[model samples]
Target: SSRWSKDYDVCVCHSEEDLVAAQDLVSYLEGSTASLRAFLQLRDATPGGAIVSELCQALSSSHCRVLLITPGFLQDPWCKYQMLQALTEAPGAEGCTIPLLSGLSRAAYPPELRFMYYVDGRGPDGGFRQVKEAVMRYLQTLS
Candidate 1:
């Protein structure tokens, strides 16, 4: 699919507590590539709309999904729900889901997500470079 086809290149799943990091990652993706667009929570969601529906729409419209799973994400009910829904939608084979682990132990990585490799967020700059590379790679295969 071309860049024009999707509402966003990537949809980020994150928690309120992790918004700061998420925003930085979003900035990284958008800034690093002129073609990359991200669906950021609250910023991209409609005002006063149902969270579940809006979130689903974002996930559907984006070509790829990124789970910025942190300690906050594990504790967040919404993040967990989104995580499960994303997996249910595409699992691992499609290579559309990218998981970035930060401020969390690799051992604590969700068991179901183990099939796909995750980016090491403990890296300098939050592993933003790798995340950007993954999206570009996925997009390359899409065309």
Candidate 2:
């Protein structure tokens, strides 16, 4: 007999330039977080990647978790698609996302979506802290 534990992978999608800026976003979370792996893709492609369904299907079987970062996420259509897709895939995981938004008044988004975690990016430090706290709380709820 064989035994296995599910593994989780995280996907981060942002703009090409922001993709570079998000290195820290990736590094900081990936390094500090546990039981999860993270990756980044430019917004030029589909939200998840060139092979979104494929990648997600693969990751799904691998028990991977997808994290879509806006950082300026609202402006990125691909990021929206990714969010929509993730919402579809993980309907049961609603309100479990860590939204990193723009620090502006217009950044205020509607909560009618009834999906995804929308964290207020009031500032860099506070925003990430909120996400970290939320993830921890979400993890506890999961297990």
lDDT values, one for every candidate: 0.58, 0.50
How does each model score on TM-score?
0.57, 0.52
lDDT of 1: 0.58
Q: Worst 10-residue stretch by lDDT in candidate 2?
A: 59-68
lDDT of 2 by residue, 1-143 (tens): 47755434565444464455456655666775664576664534346545423444443433333243444655455555556644455535433345555464444333333443444556655564354444555566567
lDDT of 2 at 120: 53
**Per-residue lDDT for 24-54 in model 1, tens only?**
7678667855457676664355566574444
- Residue 108's lDDT within candidate 2 is 39
